[PDB]
């Protein structure tokens, strides 16, 4: 249908139904997180709080995943076993990560039903991230005591970060257990995150795919690629803002320093991916908790193999966490080369021209001479355009599927990004 009928239907056909369904599918999780937030303010024994959040986590996992939730429950139990047998070793991170790796690999070799496994990637990913994080924090000395069974269980089944929620440190969960007052900034954060979650859901389902023919008079492979990319980006921002809202509702997600408590849990930064400066910023602002996790527990350990091999190991861990699909594996393998080549080329350029064109904004005290010139702005905007081009080329895979589908989707675009980064790399090596 043309733009006339499209906008004649739009509101009552997509904007209200999608929002009503999005609310009807998360209202119970929100009610449970609010019940936990109100119950953790009564001054209960800590073990009773941990048991209550274990019960709430069971209820939420059952509500979202009817009976397959065992494949999460079991995992948690297994994790605690691996945490109890080596509670004295300094290897806790290594043992827990190897256990998680073997578990996810056996799951992705169809030892579990291929549709039962695909449904619970989001819960198993968070449980695995939390277990490996606790195992490494105990080694590095950032967590003092190995937790008791109820503390570990209440950590893995934290009702705020169990279904959609981001990864949170063990101490960032203990601080949520001890409870903070129900301020008004808390309610403002919850409300703004819920409103932005619904807004991104609406823009992902309705405005996303129908952008260029209807919302723009523009219209074609690249336009379809870009609208698929933005629909994927906003479908991600929906889950990001919803996890932020459901973790700030349950009490977690805050930082306090010198008698000042601020609810500043940010999972995604949409303006750093829609108006990007470089692909490094895109990768690190797509998911901030996951970027911190992957940099702290996979990169800082695999860094012995060299910087590039460590980047490859980090992106392989990211592809394994997110579930091994061929389109996602190809995207996360192209992202390694893209971000590395762009970072090192911008590095050599900012060293040669002495301009502040580094893949991230330079701090106020830097050697670069030309900082706010218009040539620097032109170069930064050219690299932002290259980042948008890479984003479209990579997000064209998520049109709404193994090697054939990805090679087909990327062959229509003439493999443009994989030649652009090759050209950037040979340009890096020429000016070397």
């Amino acid at each position: 249908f043309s733009r006339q009928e499209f906008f004649q239907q739009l509101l009552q056909g997509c904007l209200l139904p999608t929002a009503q369904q999005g609310l009807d599918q998360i209202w119970l999780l929100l009610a449970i997180c609010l019940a936990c937030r109100l119950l953790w303010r009564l001054g209960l024994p800590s073990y009773l709080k941990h048991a209550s959040t274990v019960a709430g986590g069971f209820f939420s996992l059952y509500h979202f995943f009817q009976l397959h939730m065992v494949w999460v429950v079991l995992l948690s139990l297994l994790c605690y076993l691996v945490l109890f047998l080596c509670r004295h070793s300094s290897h806790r991170g290594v043992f827990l990560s190897v256990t998680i790796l073997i578990y996810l690999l056996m799951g992705e070799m169809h030892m579990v039903d291929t549709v039962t496994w695909h449904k619970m990637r989001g819960a198993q990913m968070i449980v695995a991230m939390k277990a490996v994080s606790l195992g490494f924090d105990l080694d590095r000395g950032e967590v003092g005591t190995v937790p008791s069974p109820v503390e570990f269980m209440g950590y893995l089944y934290f009702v705020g970060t169990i279904v959609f929620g981001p990864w949170i440190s063990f101490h960032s969960y203990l601080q949520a257990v001890q409870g903070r007052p129900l301020s008004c900034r808390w309610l403002q954060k919850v409300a703004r995150s819920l409103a932005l979650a619904l807004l991104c859901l609406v823009l992902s389902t309705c405005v996303g795919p129908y952008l260029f023919p209807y919302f723009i008079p523009l219209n074609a492979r690249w336009l379809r690629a870009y609208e698929s990319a933005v629909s994927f980006h906003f479908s991600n921002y929906f889950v990001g803002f919803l996890s932020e809202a459901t973790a700030t509702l349950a009490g977690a997600g805050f930082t306090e320093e010198k008698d000042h408590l601020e609810w500043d849990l940010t999972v995604s930064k949409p303006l750093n991916v829609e108006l990007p400066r470089s692909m490094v910023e895109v990768v690190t602002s797509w998911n901030l908790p996951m970027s911190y996790w992957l940099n702290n527990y996979v990169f800082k350990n695999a860094l012995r193999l060299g910087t590039f091999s460590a980047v490859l190991v980090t992106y392989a861990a990211s592809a394994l966490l997110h579930g091994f699909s061929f389109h996602l594996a190809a995207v996360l393998l192209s992202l390694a080369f893209i971000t590395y080549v762009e970072h090192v080329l911008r590095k050599r350029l900012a060293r040669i021209l002495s301009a502040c064109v580094l893949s991230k904004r330079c701090p106020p005290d830097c050697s670069h001479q030309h900082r706010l010139g218009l040539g620097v702005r032109a170069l930064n905007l050219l690299f932002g355009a290259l980042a948008i081009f890479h984003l479209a080329y990579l997000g064209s895979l998520f049109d709404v599927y193994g090697m054939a589908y990805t090679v087909h989707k990327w062959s229509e675009l003439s493999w443009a990004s994989h030649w652009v980064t090759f050209g950037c790399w040979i340009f890096y090596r020429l000016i070397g």
Partner: antibody, heavy 119, light 107 residues
Framework: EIQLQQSGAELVKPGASVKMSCKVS????????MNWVKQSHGKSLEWIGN????????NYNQKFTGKATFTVDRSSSTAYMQLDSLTSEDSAVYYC????????????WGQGTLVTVSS | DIHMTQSPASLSAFVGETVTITCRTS??????LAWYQQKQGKSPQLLVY???TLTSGVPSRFSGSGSGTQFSLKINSLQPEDFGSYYC?????????FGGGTKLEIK
């Protein structure tokens, strides 16, 4: 019998650097963290940091960062700490302390290296 | 940084008496608090951890207690080998901070 044999007393001129050693005996050197503690004359203790001997990742106290650097030698089962740019305030007794394993309480301590910064 | 205040800074008592040391905590450490005893000219020695669990080999007259931000160590039937400095140290998470220290003297 666990024994953390620590180096002898050192006397360093200001602005220089010193290197204490703590040789481990009686357990697997790469099995437990090795915290470092500092105690002035008749004052409280202060946790400088620890080093994980399995993977050599360290964990510093931000009050002691840039001043103390931890290293290990697994062939000799020794843990070294290097203090840089010593001043008159760095004259204290420095202990090495093994973590208890499960918790990070300091179960086995050294005998202390008396560092004296003067003329 | 958590600030572990310890009281009193110095107390005196006879042999066979009963003494109590308190370690108030700036932030909230759940039950993670340890007690070390350092004699004159020696290295400290862990006595209590988890604020109540006596370590292996310590007489049963030392008793830890408390939780939250108010912990205490009680020594009843004071004996000659119980005089020294007592330091409370949280093991909640790095950086680990010790207390000021209570100098127990002979009366």
């Amino acid at each position: 019998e666990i024994q953390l044999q620590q180096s002898g007393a050192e006397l360093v001129k200001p602005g220089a650097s010193v290197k204490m050693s703590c040789k481990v005996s009686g357990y697997s050197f790469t099995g437990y963290n090795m915290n470092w503690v500092k105690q002035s004359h008749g004052k409280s203790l202060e946790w400088i940091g620890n080093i994980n001997p399995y993977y050599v990742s360290t964990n510093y106290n931000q009050k002691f960062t840039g001043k103390a650097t931890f290293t290990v030698d697994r062939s000799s089962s020794t843990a070294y700490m290097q203090l840089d740019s010593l001043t008159s305030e760095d004259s204290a007794v420095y202990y090495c302390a093994r973590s208890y394993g499960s918790s990070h309480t300091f179960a086995y301590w050294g005998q202390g290296t008396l560092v004296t910064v003067s003329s | 940084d958590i600030h572990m205040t310890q009281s009193p800074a110095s107390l005196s008592a006879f042999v066979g008496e009963t003494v109590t040391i308190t370690c108030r905590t700036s932030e909230n450490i759940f039950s993670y608090l340890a007690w070390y005893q350092q004699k004159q000219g020696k290295s400290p020695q862990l006595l209590v951890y988890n604020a109540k669990t006596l370590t292996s080999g310590v007489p049963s007259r030392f008793s830890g207690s408390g939780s939250g931000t108010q912990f205490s160590l009680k020594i009843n039937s004071l004996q000659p080998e119980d005089f020294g400095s007592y330091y409370c140290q949280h093991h909640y998470g790095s950086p680990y901070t010790f207390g000021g220290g209570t100098k127990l003297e002979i009366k």
